[PDB]
Design a protein around this ligand. Structure first.
Ligand code: ADP
Length: 686
């Protein structure tokens, strides 16, 4: 009811609408703005001309207000003290203004070893602070010129930031619809203030003087002249709150050194809304704690570390500090860290207990996964307490098969060591799926295209319609896809993109990261059938979809013959494809690119398993050679089945592909693909 409140404001009369027609019982302005308080202060004005009615207006206009007051300037907090002091000490109880507040923005005082590098629990981390500049009023009392001055001074500081803090400023006045659309996508844009901010006078001269700064990494974000002069945000996926706090402090302290902030001993940093006083800080973490949420100690942990939990997928909560006043920013972050760590240990207890016994669901005879076939309780009990150097357990490896009972295999490797440490399971699975290959036989890799003699089969394209060869590779030195930490995944993306951008000739192309993928870029790539989406339930349970879509992307050449998927199911899925028949050309292109990547980075590889992958089906050559070919006549001939078995290739309604991956080189596999097709099309002249 803006129109009603204006009538009282125009008379400078007591705001009757506070006398609950439908006013919030908890409303602090209703509680502390009494007739005598109003009478005592209604004629007082700050140097900036802020009145009591200016400060209380939002709370009278918006009767559902929890707080209902905004300060126009620093003087408002003293001049209208009797009102603000009561509101502050009630909202921030048991804080006492007489006690005082101590700020601390030294990140070195924070002790925060990274809680969750593997991202088993924590999804994202974010720290926000609100700050106001010296020499000016607060948001409701800022003049038109002052706001422009603030924009000018802040941008000057922000545009001179270096390192990971370097970035771009986007003012709201103007902003191409293109730019706007992009910022909405990143969730970096703020809109006109809601009814609470409107009634506080915060939307004055919208959108003049308002703007957005972000660094190139998009891990640092500043809102200029929104609810306060500055809303400064440091954030990233994963759990590294110490890193997040450090980046925040570097930027905030630099701005403070050049401009200075509004700050008192009793209020801490000054903000428009009294709720944001003190640290002006909200430190936050998104974390999956379904089991901890139901533990009886849950609420007592929140109370103990002074944190709160809010609903956001399933079991994922927003954990943030409850306190602003009476504690330092350092103490606030530390309490956040300790509370989250405590809740994480709870979650780890429940999961460890549940993983301590043999998965009873595997005892069902309707389950026909390889996991069920080979994993006995005795084998489980022999392996269950063991972990690789990266902390990968047996249960980590079989999790997808236990969560998805309809798995064909159900077992993934988090790292190379899994194939050794959990050999009594992996050996059986490998030798079963890749039967009759024996691990003792060892495997020979060979990516020399000159050792293939494959003259073109069907240059008319009479039968063969297209030729596709894919290889799966993983980068040496890292875990496999299910076991990747956040930093590993990003590091792999950076290195591979660095290599792919050095590719010349017809290998030249560019990289399309899934993160920051607009609309025009997406739907296009999809038409080419180049786009890959998020993994399914099997990959999710394996740990392949962690931090999606961070670090994922697509590279293709101009001719669209050479394609690379980065950090999908394997770290590198490399595809060469074209035309109709020339198997020898596809492979030559494939080898040129793969060998160059191999030379710069290296691949995970053993004698026994060939090229390593998270999924045992992709071992050895890690290669799929496929032929699309019209063969009506030979498919019914009594030699067709003799042929497929003799050359160990499979035919599927008419996809012609290799069945073998282990115990043969890539040269040998391609040559056999050729020869098999050669005798198949041979009958297409019966
Ligand atoms: N740890 C986090 N990771 C990612 N996003 C977050 C995190 N914490 C909060 N957010 C998002 O930031 C947005 C604004 O946060 P909000 O709860 O309004 O805090 P603030 O008062 O600092 O703006 C919300 O949409 C919320 O989903």
């Amino acid at each position: 009811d803006p129109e009603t409140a204006a009538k009282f404001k125009s008379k400078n009369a007591f705001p009757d609408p506070l006398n609950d027609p439908k006013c919030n019982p908890k409303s602090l302005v209703k509680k502390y703005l009494t007739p005598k308080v109003f009478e005592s202060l209604k004629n007082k004005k700050t140097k900036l001309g802020i009145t009591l009615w200016d400060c209380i207006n939002s709370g009278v206009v918006n009767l559902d207000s929890g707080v209902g007051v905004y300060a126009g300037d620093e003087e408002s907090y003293t001049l209208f003290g009797p009102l603000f002091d009561a509101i502050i000490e009630d909202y921030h109880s048991p804080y006492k203004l007489a006690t005082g507040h101590n700020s601390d923005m030294n990140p070195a005082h924070v002790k925060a070893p990274d809680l969750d590098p593997a991202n088993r629990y924590i999804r994202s981390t974010r720290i926000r602070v609100a700050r106001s500049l010296k020499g000016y009023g607060l948001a409701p009392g800022v003049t038109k010129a002052h706001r422009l001055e603030i924009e000018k001074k802040v941008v000057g500081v922000l545009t001179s930031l270096t390192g990971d803090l370097a970035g771009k400023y986007y003012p709201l006045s103007g902003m191409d619809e293109k730019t706007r659309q992009q910022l909405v996508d990143d969730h970096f844009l703020f809109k006109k203030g809601d009814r609470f901010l409107e009634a506080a006078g915060i939307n004055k001269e919208w959108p003049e003087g308002r703007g957005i700064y972000h660094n190139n990494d998009k891990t640092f974000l500043v809102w200029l002249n929104e609810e306060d002069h500055l809303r400064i945000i440091s954030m990233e996926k994963g759990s590294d709150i110490g890193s997040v706090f450090s980046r925040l402090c570097r930027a905030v302290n630099e701005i403070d050194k050049k401009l200075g902030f509004q700050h008192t001993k009793k209020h801490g940093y000054l903000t428009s809304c009294p709720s944001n006083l003190g640290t002006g800080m909200r430190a936050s973490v998104h974390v999956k704690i379904p089991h901890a949420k139901e533990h009886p100690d849950f609420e007592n942990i929140l109370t103990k570390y002074h944190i709160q939990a809010r609903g956001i997928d399933a079991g994922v909560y927003d954990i943030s500090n409850r306190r602003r006043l009476g504690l330092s920013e350092v103490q606030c972050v530390q309490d956040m860290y300790d509370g989250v760590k405590a809740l994480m240990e709870l979650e780890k207890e429940a999961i460890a207990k549940k993983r301590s016994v043999f998965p009873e669901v595997l005892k069902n005879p309707e389950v026909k996964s390889l996991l069920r076939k080979y994993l006995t309780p005795e084998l489980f009990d022999s392996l269950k307490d063991k972990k690789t150097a990266k902390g990968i357990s047996l249960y980590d490896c079989i999790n997808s098969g236990v969560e998805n009972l309809d798995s064909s295999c159900g077992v993934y490797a988090g790292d190379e060591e899994c194939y050794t440490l959990f050999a009594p399971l992996f050996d059986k699975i490998v030798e079963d799926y890749h039967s009759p290959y024996k691990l003792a036989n060892k495997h020979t890799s060979d990516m020399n295209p000159e050792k293939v003699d494959a003259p073109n089969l069907d240059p008319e394209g009479t039968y063969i319609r297209s030729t596709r060869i894919r290889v799966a590779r993983n980068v040496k030195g890292y875990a496999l896809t299910p076991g990747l930490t956040r930093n590993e995944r990003l590091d792999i993306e950076r290195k591979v993109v660095g290599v792919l951008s050095s590719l010349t000739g017809d290998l030249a192309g560019q990289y399309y990261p899934l993160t920051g993928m607009d609309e025009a870029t997406r739907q296009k790539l999809v038409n080419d059938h180049f786009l890959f989406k998020k993994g399914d339930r099997f990959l999710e349970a394996a740990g392949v979809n962690k931090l999606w879509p961070e670090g994922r992307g697509i590279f293709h050449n101009n001719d669209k013959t050479f394609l690379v998927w980065i950090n999908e199911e394997d770290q590198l899925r490399i595809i060469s494809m074209e035309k109709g028949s020339d198997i020898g050309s596809v492979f030559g292109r494939l080898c040129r690119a793969v060998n160059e990547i191999d030379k710069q980075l290296g691949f995970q590889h053993t004698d026994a398993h060939g090229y390593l992958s998270g999924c045992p089906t992709n071992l050895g050559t890690g290669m799929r050679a496929s032929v699309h070919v019209k063969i009506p006549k030979a498919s019914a001939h009594p030699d067709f089945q003799k042929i497929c078995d003799e050359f160990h290739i499979q035919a599927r309604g008419f996809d012609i592909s290799n069945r073998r991956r282990l115990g043969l080189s890539e040269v040998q596999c391609v040559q056999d693909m050729y020869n098999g097709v050669k005798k198949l099309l041979e009958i297409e002249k019966s």
